[PDB]
Enzyme design. Structure first.
Site, PDB file in Angstrom:
ATOM      1  N   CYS A 130       0.887  -1.000   0.114  1.00  0.00           N
ATOM      2  CA  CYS A 130       0.066   0.031  -0.073  1.00  0.00           C
ATOM      3  C   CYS A 130       0.897   1.220  -0.056  1.00  0.00           C
ATOM      4  CB  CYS A 130      -0.884   0.156   1.331  1.00  0.00           C
ATOM      5  SG  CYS A 130      -2.179   1.400   1.143  1.00  0.00           S
TER       6      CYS A 130
ATOM      7  N   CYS B 252      -0.617   4.031   2.342  1.00  0.00           N
ATOM      8  CA  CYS B 252      -0.625   3.968   3.868  1.00  0.00           C
ATOM      9  C   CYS B 252      -0.271   2.877   4.327  1.00  0.00           C
ATOM     10  CB  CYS B 252      -1.941   4.627   4.266  1.00  0.00           C
ATOM     11  SG  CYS B 252      -3.427   3.786   3.337  1.00  0.00           S
ATOM     12  N   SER B 253      -1.212   1.998   4.505  1.00  0.00           N
ATOM     13  CA  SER B 253      -0.925   0.655   5.246  1.00  0.00           C
ATOM     14  C   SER B 253      -2.067  -0.570   4.893  1.00  0.00           C
ATOM     15  CB  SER B 253      -0.867   0.965   6.690  1.00  0.00           C
ATOM     16  OG  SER B 253      -2.028   1.585   7.051  1.00  0.00           O
ATOM     17  N   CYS B 254      -2.568  -0.491   3.438  1.00  0.00           N
ATOM     18  CA  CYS B 254      -3.865  -1.227   3.524  1.00  0.00           C
ATOM     19  C   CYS B 254      -3.245  -2.883   3.418  1.00  0.00           C
ATOM     20  CB  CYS B 254      -4.695  -0.756   2.353  1.00  0.00           C
ATOM     21  SG  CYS B 254      -4.826   0.960   2.560  1.00  0.00           S
TER      22      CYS B 254
HETATM   23 CO   LIG Z   1      -3.047   1.553   3.638  1.00  0.00          CO
END
Ligand SMILES: [Co+3]
Lengths: 219, 201
Positions: free
Chosen positions: B106, B109-111
């Site tokens: 991601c 972000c951090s998905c």
């Molecule tokens: Co994310």
């Protein structure tokens, strides 16, 4: 938003260091911060898209210096004030202003059920699909100051639609109180050469990115 | 040469106090329920993790019918094993083949697929991995001790939407008639992210 968060393709961040045998929570305070997210989302204090954009809007240095859960802590201290759930004073003093004036939506009885169910962004109906798998598409060159999900490294680039995932909420509007404006989401395939150029590329490698219908145009 | 932006740098000296203060405030206003929050923590400390995905992979390895169902509908597929929910509502399973090696990230972000892999490790959420994975997959993978054949295509999937991805690793050679359970022990978190391969017997 063309902010520090849009990292795709950046240089100078260095080697990927990886802690061996890493715990879910490295510090206790992380546990508090992490568990707060579901509690506040459940209240409807804010939606997940406003959440992401709150993080995108913290100082670039603070974003880089801060560990992951500091990002979350920032949102809670700031987005809650913007939404008018808290005052800057309440948030600074630490002490509330008028006592127990709300009731937590996330109670022990529903935790498991909520976590097991979640909240899909898929919607029944929305804008019709303009593209079919196999179509060559070009990502529109857009630079909104607000929330968007078309990474900077894809803009202007040409790719091939490989998957039509169906209709979903559009974060660009959902993050700014403009409604869901559901539309199709496609997985688009780009070649390494198309994204990075002749020199910085490998012949076999491809990159797939999930983009909304109106992010695109026919090649 | 301390850590600075790789996700493992030190937090501020007063972070715990700031967190304790906000928590008290939120509880005082009646916005959050401490007891419910403990249940959330427990869920991701002890109940949800990569062992889930491992069971999914192992089952797909031994059961061709299940594999077909899983690849047709990831969400339903993982549900057959009792996995579902937050950050896994719309799953897409990526099958590694002799011709294709999948890996996801991601960049924004951090998905990450919570129901099957649990919460992501710090490195997955940080700039080094996110920035480089889409431009130089092989360079990054080499840092993980994984070298992909030059003729083998690498597919990097960027989690920019609400789809969540999990990689179905290729089954290690020399694992005939292994039970589902024994096969699952070979499936590492890395092998399901794409930043590694299943353990070899
Ligand atoms: Co994310």
């Amino acid at each position: 938003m063309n902010g520090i968060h849009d990292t795709g393709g950046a240089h100078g961040y260095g080697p990927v260091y990886r802690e061996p045998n890493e715990p879910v929570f490295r510090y206790d305070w992380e546990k508090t911060v992490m568990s707060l997210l579901p509690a506040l989302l459940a209240n409807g204090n804010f939606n997940l898209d406003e959440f992401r954009h709150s993080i995108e809007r913290m100082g670039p240095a603070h974003y880089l210096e801060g560990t992951y859960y500091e990002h979350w802590l920032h949102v809670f201290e700031n987005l809650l004030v913007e939404k008018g759930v808290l005052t800057a004073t309440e948030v600074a003093t630490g002490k509330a202003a008028s006592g127990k004036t709300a009731t937590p939506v996330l109670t022990p009885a529903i935790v498991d059920g909520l976590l097991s169910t979640g909240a899909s962004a898929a919607r029944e109906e929305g804008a019709r699909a303009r593209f079919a798998v196999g179509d060559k598409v070009r990502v529109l060159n857009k630079n909104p100051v607000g929330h968007t999900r078309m990474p900077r490294y894809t803009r202007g680039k040409v790719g091939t639609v490989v998957i039509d995932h169906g209709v979903f909420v559009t974060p660009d509007t959902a993050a700014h109180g403009k409604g869901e404006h559901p539309q199709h989401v496609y997985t688009v395939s780009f070649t390494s050469v198309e994204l990075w150029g002749q020199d910085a590329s490998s012949p076999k490698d491809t990159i797939r990115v999930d983009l909304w219908d109106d992010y695109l145009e026919p090649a | 040469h301390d850590h600075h932006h790789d996700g493992y740098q030190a937090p501020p000296e007063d972070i715990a106090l700031r967190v304790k203060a906000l928590e008290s405030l939120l509880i005082e206003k009646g916005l959050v329920d401490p007891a419910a929050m403990d249940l959330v923590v427990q869920t991701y400390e002890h109940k949800v993790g990569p062992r889930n995905g491992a069971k999914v992979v192992a089952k797909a390895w031994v059961d061709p019918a299940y594999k077909a169902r899983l690849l047709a509908d990831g969400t339903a597929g993982i549900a057959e094993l009792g996995f579902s929910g937050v950050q896994g509502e719309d799953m897409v399973i990526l099958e590694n083949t002799p011709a294709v090696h999948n890996v996801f990230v991601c960049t924004l972000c951090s998905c990450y697929p919570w129901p099957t892999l649990g919460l992501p490790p710090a490195w997955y959420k940080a700039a080094p991995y996110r920035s480089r994975m889409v431009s130089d997959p092989r360079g990054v993978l080499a840092e993980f001790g994984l070298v992909i054949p030059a003729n083998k295509e690498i597919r990097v999937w960027d989690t920019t939407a609400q789809l969540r991805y999990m990689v179905l690793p290729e089954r290690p050679a020399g694992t005939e008639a292994y039970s589902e359970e024994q096969l699952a022990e070979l499936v590492t978190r890395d092998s399901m992210i794409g930043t590694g391969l299943p353990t070899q017997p």
